[PDB]
Tab-separated table of C-alpha atoms and ligand atoms in Angstrom:
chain	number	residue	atom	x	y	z
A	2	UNK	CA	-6.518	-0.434	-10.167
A	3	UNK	CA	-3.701	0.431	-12.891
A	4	UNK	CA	-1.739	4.093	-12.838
A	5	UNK	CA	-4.073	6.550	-14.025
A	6	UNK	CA	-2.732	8.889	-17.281
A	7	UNK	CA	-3.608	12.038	-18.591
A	8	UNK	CA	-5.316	12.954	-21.685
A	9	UNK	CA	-3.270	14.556	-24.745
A	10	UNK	CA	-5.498	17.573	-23.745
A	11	UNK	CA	-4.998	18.262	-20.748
A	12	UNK	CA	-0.626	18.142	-20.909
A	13	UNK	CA	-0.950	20.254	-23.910
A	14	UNK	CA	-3.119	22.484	-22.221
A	15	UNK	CA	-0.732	22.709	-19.519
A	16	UNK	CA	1.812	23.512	-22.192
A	17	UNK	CA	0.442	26.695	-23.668
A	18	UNK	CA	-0.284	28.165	-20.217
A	19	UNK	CA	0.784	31.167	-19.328
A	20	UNK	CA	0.839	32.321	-15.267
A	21	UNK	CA	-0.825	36.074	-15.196
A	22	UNK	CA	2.409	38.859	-14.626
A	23	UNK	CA	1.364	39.525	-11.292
A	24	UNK	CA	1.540	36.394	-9.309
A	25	UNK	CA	5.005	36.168	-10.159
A	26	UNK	CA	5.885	38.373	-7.637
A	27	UNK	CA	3.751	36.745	-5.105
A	28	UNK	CA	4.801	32.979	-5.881
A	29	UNK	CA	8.497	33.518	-4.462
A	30	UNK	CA	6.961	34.259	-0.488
A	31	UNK	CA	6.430	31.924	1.997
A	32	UNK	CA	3.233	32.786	3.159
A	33	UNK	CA	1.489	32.308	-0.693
A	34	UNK	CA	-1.843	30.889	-0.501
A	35	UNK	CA	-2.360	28.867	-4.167
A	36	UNK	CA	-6.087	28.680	-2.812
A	37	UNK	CA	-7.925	31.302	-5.246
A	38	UNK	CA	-6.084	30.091	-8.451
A	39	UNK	CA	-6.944	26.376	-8.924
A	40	UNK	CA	-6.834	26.648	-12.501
A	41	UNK	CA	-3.459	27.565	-12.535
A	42	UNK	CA	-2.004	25.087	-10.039
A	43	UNK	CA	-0.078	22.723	-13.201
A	44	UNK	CA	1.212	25.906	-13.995
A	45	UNK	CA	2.543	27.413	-11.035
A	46	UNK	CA	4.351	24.221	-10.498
A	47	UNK	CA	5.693	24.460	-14.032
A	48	UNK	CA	7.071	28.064	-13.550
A	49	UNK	CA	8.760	27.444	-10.043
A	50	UNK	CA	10.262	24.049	-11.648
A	51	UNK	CA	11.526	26.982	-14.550
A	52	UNK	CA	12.811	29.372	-12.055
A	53	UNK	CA	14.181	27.003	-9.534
A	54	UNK	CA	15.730	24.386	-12.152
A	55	UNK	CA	15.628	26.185	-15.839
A	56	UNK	CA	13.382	26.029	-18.597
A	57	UNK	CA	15.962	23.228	-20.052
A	58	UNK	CA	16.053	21.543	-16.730
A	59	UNK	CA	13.212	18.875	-18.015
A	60	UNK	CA	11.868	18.001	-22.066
A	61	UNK	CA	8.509	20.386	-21.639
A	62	UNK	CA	6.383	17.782	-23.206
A	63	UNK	CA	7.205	15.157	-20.671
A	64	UNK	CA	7.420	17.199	-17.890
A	65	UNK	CA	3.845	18.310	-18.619
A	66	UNK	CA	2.595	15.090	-18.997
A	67	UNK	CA	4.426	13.941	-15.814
A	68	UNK	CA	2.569	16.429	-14.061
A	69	UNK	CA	-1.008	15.727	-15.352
A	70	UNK	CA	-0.678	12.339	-14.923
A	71	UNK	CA	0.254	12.680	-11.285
A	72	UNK	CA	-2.505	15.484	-10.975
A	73	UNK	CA	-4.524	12.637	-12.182
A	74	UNK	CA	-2.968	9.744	-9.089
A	75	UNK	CA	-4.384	12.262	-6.373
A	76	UNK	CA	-7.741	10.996	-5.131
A	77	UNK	CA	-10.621	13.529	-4.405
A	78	UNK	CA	-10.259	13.294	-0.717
A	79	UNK	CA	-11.229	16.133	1.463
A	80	UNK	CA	-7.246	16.885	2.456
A	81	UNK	CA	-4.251	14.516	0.947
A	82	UNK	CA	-5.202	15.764	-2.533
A	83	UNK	CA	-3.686	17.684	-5.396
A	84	UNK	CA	-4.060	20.992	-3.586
A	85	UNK	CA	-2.072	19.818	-0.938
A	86	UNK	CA	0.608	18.718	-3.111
A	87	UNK	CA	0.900	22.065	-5.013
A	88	UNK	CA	1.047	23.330	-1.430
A	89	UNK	CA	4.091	21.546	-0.046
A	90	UNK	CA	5.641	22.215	-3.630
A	91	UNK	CA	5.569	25.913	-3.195
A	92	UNK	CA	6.585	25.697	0.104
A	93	UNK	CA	9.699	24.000	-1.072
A	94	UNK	CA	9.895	26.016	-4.179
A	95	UNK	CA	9.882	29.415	-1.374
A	96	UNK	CA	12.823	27.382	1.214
A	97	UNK	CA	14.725	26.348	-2.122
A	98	UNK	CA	14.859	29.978	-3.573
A	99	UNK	CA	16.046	31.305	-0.390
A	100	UNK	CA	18.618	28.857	0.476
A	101	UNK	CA	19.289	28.312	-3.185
A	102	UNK	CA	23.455	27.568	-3.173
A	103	UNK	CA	23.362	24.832	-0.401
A	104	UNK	CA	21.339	22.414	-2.884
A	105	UNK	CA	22.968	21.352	-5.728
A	106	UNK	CA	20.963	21.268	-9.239
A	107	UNK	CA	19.913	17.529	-8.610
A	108	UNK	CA	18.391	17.617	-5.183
A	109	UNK	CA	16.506	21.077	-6.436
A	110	UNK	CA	14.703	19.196	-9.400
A	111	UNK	CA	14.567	15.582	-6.990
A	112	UNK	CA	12.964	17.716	-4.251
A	113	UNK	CA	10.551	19.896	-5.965
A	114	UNK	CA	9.156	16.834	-7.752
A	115	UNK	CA	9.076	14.464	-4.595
A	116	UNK	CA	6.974	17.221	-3.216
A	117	UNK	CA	4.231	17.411	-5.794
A	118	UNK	CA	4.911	13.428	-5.527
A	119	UNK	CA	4.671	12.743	-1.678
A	120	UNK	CA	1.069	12.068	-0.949
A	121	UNK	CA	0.203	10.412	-4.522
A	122	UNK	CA	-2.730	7.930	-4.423
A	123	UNK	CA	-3.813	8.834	-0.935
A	124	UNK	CA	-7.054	7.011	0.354
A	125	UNK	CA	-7.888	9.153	3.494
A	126	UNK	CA	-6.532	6.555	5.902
A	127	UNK	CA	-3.226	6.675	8.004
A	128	UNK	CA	-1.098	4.209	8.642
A	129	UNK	CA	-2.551	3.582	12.218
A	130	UNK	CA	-6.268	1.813	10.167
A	131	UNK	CA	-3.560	0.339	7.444
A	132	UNK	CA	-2.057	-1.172	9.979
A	133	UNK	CA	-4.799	-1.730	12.699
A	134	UNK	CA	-6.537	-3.544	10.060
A	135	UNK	CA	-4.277	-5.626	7.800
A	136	UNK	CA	-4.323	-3.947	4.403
A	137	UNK	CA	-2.561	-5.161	1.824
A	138	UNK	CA	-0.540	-2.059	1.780
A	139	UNK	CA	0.443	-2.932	5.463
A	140	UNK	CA	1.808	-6.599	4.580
A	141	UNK	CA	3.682	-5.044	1.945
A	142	UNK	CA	5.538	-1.876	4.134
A	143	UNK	CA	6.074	-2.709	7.490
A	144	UNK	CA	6.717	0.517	8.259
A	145	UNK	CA	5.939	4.046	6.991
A	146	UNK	CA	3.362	1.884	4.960
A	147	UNK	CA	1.702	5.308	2.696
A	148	UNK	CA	5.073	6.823	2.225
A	149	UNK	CA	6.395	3.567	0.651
A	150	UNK	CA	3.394	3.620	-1.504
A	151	UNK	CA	3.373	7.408	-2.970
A	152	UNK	CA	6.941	6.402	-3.417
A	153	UNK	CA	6.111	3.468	-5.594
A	154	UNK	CA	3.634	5.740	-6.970
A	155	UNK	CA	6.123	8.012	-8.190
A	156	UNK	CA	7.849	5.348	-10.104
A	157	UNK	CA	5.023	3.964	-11.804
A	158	UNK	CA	4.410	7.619	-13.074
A	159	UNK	CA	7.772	8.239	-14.007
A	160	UNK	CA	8.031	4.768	-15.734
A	161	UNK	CA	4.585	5.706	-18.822
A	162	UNK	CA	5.878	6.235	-21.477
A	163	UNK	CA	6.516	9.700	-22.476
A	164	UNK	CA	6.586	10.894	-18.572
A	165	UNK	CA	10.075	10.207	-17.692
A	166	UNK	CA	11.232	13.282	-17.139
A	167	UNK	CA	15.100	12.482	-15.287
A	168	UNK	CA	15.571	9.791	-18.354
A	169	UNK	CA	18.482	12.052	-19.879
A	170	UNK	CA	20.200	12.005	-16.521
A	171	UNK	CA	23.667	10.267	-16.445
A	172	UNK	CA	23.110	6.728	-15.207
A	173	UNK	CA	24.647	7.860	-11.805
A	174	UNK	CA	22.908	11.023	-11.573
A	175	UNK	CA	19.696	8.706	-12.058
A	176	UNK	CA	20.189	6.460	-9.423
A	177	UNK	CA	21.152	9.315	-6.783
A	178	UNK	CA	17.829	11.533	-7.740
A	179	UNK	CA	15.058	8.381	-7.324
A	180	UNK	CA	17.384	8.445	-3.906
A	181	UNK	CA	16.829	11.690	-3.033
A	182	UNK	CA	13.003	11.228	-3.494
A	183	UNK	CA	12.687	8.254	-2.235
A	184	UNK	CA	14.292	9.412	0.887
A	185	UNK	CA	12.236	12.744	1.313
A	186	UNK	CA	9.026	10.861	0.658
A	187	UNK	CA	10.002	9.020	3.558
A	188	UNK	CA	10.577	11.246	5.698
A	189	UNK	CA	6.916	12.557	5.205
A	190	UNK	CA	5.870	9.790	7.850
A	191	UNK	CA	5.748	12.272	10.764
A	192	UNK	CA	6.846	9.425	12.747
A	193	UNK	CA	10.058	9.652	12.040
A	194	UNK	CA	9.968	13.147	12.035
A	195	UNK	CA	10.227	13.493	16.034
A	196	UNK	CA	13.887	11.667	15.868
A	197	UNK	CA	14.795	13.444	12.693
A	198	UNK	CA	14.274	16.909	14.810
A	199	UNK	CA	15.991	15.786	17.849
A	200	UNK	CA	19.193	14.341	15.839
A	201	UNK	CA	19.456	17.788	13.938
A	202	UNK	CA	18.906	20.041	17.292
A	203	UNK	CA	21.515	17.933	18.876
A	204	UNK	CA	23.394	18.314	16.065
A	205	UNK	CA	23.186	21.789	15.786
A	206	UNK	CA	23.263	22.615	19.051
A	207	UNK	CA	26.706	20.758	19.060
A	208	UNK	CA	28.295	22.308	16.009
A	209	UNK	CA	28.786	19.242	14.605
A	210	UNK	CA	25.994	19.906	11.916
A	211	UNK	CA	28.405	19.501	8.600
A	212	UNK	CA	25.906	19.955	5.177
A	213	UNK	CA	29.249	18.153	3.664
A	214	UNK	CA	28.249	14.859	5.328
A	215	UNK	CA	25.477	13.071	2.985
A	216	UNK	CA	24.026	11.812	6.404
A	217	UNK	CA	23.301	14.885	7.428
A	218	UNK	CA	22.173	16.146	4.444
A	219	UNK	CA	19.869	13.741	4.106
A	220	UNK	CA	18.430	14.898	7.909
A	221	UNK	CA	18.169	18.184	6.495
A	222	UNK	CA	16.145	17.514	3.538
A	223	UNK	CA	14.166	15.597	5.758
A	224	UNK	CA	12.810	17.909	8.385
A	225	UNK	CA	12.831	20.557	5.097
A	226	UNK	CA	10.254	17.759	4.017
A	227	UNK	CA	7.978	17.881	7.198
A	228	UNK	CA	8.193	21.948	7.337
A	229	UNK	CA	6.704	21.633	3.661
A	230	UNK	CA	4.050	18.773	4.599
A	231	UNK	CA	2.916	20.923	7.531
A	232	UNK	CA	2.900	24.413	6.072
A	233	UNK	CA	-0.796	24.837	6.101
A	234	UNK	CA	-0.133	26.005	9.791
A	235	UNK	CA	2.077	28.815	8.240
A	236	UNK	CA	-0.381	30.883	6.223
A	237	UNK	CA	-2.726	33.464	7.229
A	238	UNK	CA	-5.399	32.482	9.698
A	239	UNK	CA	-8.415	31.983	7.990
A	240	UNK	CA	-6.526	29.950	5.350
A	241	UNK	CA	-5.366	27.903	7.861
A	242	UNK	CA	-8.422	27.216	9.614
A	243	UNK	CA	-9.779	26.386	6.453
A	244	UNK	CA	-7.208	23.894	6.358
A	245	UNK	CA	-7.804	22.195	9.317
A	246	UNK	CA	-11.514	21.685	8.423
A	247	UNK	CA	-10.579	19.759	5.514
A	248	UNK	CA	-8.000	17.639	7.291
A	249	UNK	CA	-10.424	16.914	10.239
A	250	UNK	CA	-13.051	15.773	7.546
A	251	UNK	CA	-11.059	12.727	6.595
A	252	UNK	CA	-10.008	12.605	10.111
A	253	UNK	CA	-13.717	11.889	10.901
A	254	UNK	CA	-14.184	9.148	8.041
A	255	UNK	CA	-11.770	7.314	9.476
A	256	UNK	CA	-12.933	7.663	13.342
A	257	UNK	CA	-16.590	6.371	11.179
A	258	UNK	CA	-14.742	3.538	9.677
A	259	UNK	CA	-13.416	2.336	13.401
A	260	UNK	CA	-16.392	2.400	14.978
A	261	UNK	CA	-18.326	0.073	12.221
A	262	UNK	CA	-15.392	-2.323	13.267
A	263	UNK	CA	-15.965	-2.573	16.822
A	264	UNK	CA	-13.320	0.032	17.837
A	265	UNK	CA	-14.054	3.658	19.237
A	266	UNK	CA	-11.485	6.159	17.714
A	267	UNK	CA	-8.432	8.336	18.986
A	268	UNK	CA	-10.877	11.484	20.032
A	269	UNK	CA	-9.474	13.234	16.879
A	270	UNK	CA	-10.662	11.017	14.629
A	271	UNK	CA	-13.737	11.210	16.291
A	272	UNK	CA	-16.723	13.826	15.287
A	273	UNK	CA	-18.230	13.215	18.197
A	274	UNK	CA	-15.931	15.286	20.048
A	275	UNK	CA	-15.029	18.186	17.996
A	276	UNK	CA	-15.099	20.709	21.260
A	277	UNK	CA	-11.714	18.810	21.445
A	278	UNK	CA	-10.256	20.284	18.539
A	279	UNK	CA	-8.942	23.295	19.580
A	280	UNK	CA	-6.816	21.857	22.467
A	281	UNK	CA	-5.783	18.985	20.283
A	282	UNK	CA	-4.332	21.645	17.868
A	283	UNK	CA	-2.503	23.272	20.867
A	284	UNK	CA	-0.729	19.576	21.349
A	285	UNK	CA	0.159	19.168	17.695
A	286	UNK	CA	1.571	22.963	17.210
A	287	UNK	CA	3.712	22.165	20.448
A	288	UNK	CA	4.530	18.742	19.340
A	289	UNK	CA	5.558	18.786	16.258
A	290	UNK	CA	4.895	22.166	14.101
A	291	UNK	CA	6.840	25.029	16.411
A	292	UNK	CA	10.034	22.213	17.343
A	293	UNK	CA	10.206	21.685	13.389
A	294	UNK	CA	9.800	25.503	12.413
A	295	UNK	CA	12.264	26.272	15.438
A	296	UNK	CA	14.471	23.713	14.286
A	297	UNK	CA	14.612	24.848	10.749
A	298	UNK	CA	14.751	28.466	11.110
A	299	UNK	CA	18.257	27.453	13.134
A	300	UNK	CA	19.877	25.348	10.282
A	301	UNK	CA	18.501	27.876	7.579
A	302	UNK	CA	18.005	31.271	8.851
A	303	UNK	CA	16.253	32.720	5.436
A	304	UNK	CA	13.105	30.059	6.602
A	305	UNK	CA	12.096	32.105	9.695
A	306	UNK	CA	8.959	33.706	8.365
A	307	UNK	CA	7.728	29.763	8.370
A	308	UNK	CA	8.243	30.010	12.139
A	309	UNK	CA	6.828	33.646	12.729
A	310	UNK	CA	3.716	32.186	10.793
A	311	UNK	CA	3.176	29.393	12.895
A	312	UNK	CA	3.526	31.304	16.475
A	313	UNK	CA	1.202	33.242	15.223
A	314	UNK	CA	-1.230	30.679	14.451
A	315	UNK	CA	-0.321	29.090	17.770
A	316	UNK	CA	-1.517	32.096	19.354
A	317	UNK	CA	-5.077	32.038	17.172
A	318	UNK	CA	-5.759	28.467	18.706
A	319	UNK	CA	-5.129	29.591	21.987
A	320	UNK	CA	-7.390	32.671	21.540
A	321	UNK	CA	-10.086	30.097	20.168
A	322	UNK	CA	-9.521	28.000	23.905
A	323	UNK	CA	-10.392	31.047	25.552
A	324	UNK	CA	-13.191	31.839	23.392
A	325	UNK	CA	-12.430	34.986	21.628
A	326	UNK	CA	-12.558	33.689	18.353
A	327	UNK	CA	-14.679	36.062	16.098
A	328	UNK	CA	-16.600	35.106	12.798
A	329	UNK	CA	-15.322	32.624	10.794
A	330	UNK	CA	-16.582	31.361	7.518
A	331	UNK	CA	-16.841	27.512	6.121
A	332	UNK	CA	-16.777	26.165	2.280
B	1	9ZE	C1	-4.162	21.248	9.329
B	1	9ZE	C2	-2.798	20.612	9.188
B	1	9ZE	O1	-2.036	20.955	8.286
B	1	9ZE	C3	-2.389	19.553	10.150
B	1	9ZE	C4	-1.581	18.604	9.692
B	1	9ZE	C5	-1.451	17.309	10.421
B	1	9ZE	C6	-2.152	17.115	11.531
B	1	9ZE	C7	-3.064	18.186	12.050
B	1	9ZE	C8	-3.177	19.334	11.404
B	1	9ZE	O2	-3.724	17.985	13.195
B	1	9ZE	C9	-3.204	17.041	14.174
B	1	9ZE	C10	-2.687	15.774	13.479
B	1	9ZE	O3	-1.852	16.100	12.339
B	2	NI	NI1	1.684	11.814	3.764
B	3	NI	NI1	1.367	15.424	2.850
């Protein structure tokens, strides 16, 4: 219950921080892993919110609060957790950097922030148990039930005092940011995704694509959005392996949960079938992560190594269904 704050130590400590010289070369590629460096995730977002938006882009002392506080709003779940949202942050902070021009200053800050934002107060549950069993989450959004929560999330955050960081935006310039957020923590809910990505391929494939046409900006953003959510499938193997293990362990909880109330789980969410896995990884890299990579790399060119990444962990999967994987190692 209540929004959970940070202490006057821990945003001060965040202010004084200084990121060691030589991961500033490293932050601005795609394929950065913020894995070995977990005391310097607040920071890292701090610098690519500098280099991205300006050191004067945000008052320091709120924006540090802001982002212990939501640090703070990220549950200690085995996946949907503050790593994650550092993740999808640097992956936005990499697509932003090299596609810098087509995003004006507002939708840089509204997006890099709605990224460290989009998965606040996860519980381990998707909105197929929300749903399934009547949360009050579920009566509350119809649809895209967790998404409307981290949104409200977001809000709540932004609305302590002392953590409103867009408060010396014009009124206008308010209003359209908490749009932009709202609207790319939306389109988180890969549900929506698969209609996003056919739109925009249709769209592209058409010429009609015109970044001068807020709809389609807004489609953009979106599938930018999902390319960030997903782009644990676009680091180096082992990284992304690890990944999955963590993601399949609240996977599993759930499949638990199901079965104490009378219903046998989707065979993913079950742990009783793990020698599924591999094949169900297969499904979800041609489903959804090589059409949105694809997709992406088309509309913004500079993204491509996002898409080379992901073919090539394609390929790993398949090698595991075939059963030349070598050793692999577990945390
Ligand atoms: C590991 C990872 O980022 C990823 C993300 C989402 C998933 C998934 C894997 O497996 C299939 C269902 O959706
Ligand atoms: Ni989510
Ligand atoms: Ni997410």
């Amino acid at each position: 219950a209540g929004t959970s704050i940070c202490t006057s130590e821990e945003w001060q400590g965040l202010m004084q921080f200084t990121l060691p010289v030589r991961l500033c070369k490293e932050i601005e590629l795609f394929h950065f892993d913020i894995g070995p460096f977990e005391n310097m995730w607040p920071g890292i977002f701090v610098y690519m919110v500098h280099r991205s938006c300006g050191t004067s882009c945000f008052e320091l002392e709120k924006l540090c609060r802001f982002i212990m506080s939501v640090k703070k709003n990220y549950r200690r779940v085995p996946y949907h957790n503050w790593k994650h949202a550092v993740t999808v942050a640097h992956c936005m902070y990499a697509i932003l950097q090299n596609n810098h021009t087509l995003f004006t200053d507002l939708e840089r800050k509204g997006l890099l922030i709605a990224c460290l934002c989009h998965d606040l107060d996860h519980r381990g549950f998707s909105n197929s148990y929300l749903q399934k069993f009547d949360h009050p989450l579920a009566a509350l959004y119809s649809t895209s039930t967790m998404e409307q929560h981290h949104f409200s999330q977001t809000v709540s955050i932004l609305q302590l005092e002392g953590h409103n960081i867009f408060s010396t935006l014009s009124s206008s310039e308010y209003e359209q940011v908490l749009e932009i957020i709202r609207k790319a923590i939306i389109a988180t809910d890969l549900a929506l995704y698969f209609g996003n990505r056919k739109q925009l391929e249709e769209m592209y494939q058409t010429g009609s694509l015109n970044l001068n046409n807020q709809s389609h900006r807004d489609r953009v953003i979106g599938l930018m959005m999902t390319a960030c959510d997903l782009c644990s499938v676009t680091k180096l193997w082992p990284v992304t392996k690890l990944t999955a293990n963590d993601i399949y362990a609240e996977f599993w909880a759930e499949g638990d949960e199901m079965k104490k109330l009378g219903i046998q789980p989707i065979p993913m969410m079950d742990r009783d079938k793990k020698d599924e896995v591999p094949q169900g990884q297969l499904g979800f890299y041609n489903a959804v992560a090589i059409p949105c990579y694809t997709t992406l790399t088309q509309i913004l060119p500079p993204t491509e190594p996002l898409l080379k990444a992901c073919r090539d962990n394609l390929s790993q999967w398949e090698k595991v269904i075939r059963g030349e994987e070598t050793a692999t190692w577990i945390s």
